[PDB]
């Protein structure tokens, strides 16, 4: 996901992990991990200049 | 993002030099002595609804016209590949940040005076390198070209696809409910002005639809009884606030999509536009879209003035050549009124009154401009307003075809 832009969530930072599922996912082999492995990087964060 | 553009400079109306003076170069409304992103600076802050004009800028279009003439003398890099100077003034830097008196160290060569020189961004390689900061030049040059090609009124583009309005654009459109057209034009100008944008973008397509919708309402084909996608433009009585048309959303019926894709070029064929804000706003808004995306296709030469016949990247007469229509506001208003009574928004008695009101209103516009022309003869040295003849106020042009297109466009 390097190069994309994402929001901050300064009020409580734990939201950051929830806001963008898929980014920096461990290569472990679990049901959720296997699903998240299919996410497309271009659809993280903002979309326009 | 679009990495190349073309253009054309203004035409001297028989005069031997571009029609501006140093004071005009000194009193631009934007940042000091820079023409870029300045076409709305004179009204960024506003009060009331009265049009803004002054002694040496006596028409709503006067400032933009002057800017176009001004740029015609200094755009040599996109023609000759080099920066030049005219009357001891040139750019500060190759980025063309602003104009300044020539320094006495390495004076650039003196510009040779000419008119209607074709322009190509590829003649000036540094633009590509500094695209991120020279982007607004793209928009302004395109605007200048779109005006230079016409002897009577700026040219702009219309189009409507066969698919319904995509959902993404609708999400953007709801941000622009109840805002007048002039403000919308200012917003549209700023968007394509600052940073480079991709031709494929939600914002771009949004403005494209805005241009189409406004034209549909202009003919009266779109109204509160027949919306595009719930959207349409609302009008005030021409007797007062004749220009405060705003955007509205409605739950009523929607016009069905056209049978095939529609597109054409548009122009005002009467001098009225030079002192009528809505024409300027509509033209600029459409031109802004064409600026970022480039010209979809060449324009038909048949109805254009002489110097515009056969411009390299602009005009043609081949197969893939979109025709250009032109109209007169007065018959247009009559057609719009006729649509309103046919759709039942008004009674015939009102329709007769509306035509009388508008014709009287238009008469003042003509009377103002014609009196203003003699006050600023073109031979003086600067052209605050474009010359014309009295008969030009009576030309009907292709107005009948124009309303026919809208009816074929929104159906």
UniProtKB/Swiss-Prot annotation, chain A:
Record's subunit section: Homodecamer; each decamer is made up of two conformers of VP2, called VP2A and VP2B. 12 homodecamers assemble to form an icosahedral capsid. Interacts with VP6.
Gene behind the chain: S3
Purpose of the protein: Inner capsid protein that self-assembles to form an icosahedral capsid with a T=2 symmetry, which consists of 120 copies of VP2, with channels at each of its five-fold vertices. This capsid constitutes the innermost concentric layer of the viral mature particle.
Organism: Aquareovirus C (isolate Golden shiner/USA/GSRV/1977) (AQRV-C)
Localization: Virion
Organism domain of life: Viruses
Protein name in the entry: Inner capsid protein VP3
Family according to the record: Belongs to the turreted BTV-fold inner capsid family.
Curated annotation (Swiss-Prot), chain B:
Domain of life: Viruses
Keyword Transmembrane helix part of the UniProt annotation: no
Keyword Endoplasmic reticulum: no
One Pfam family matching this protein: Sigma_1_2
Primary location recorded for the protein, binned into one broad class: virion
Record key words, sorted: Capsid protein, Intermediate capsid protein, Virion
Record localization: Virion
CC per GO annotation: viral intermediate capsid
Family of the protein in this entry: Belongs to the reoviridae clamp protein family.
Protein function: Located at the interface of the incomplete T=13 outer capsid and the pseudo T=2 inner capsid, 120 VP6 subunits clamp and stabilizes the inner capsid shell.
Subunit details: Interacts with capsid proteins VP3, VP5 and VP7.
Name the UniProt record assigns to this protein: Clamp protein VP6
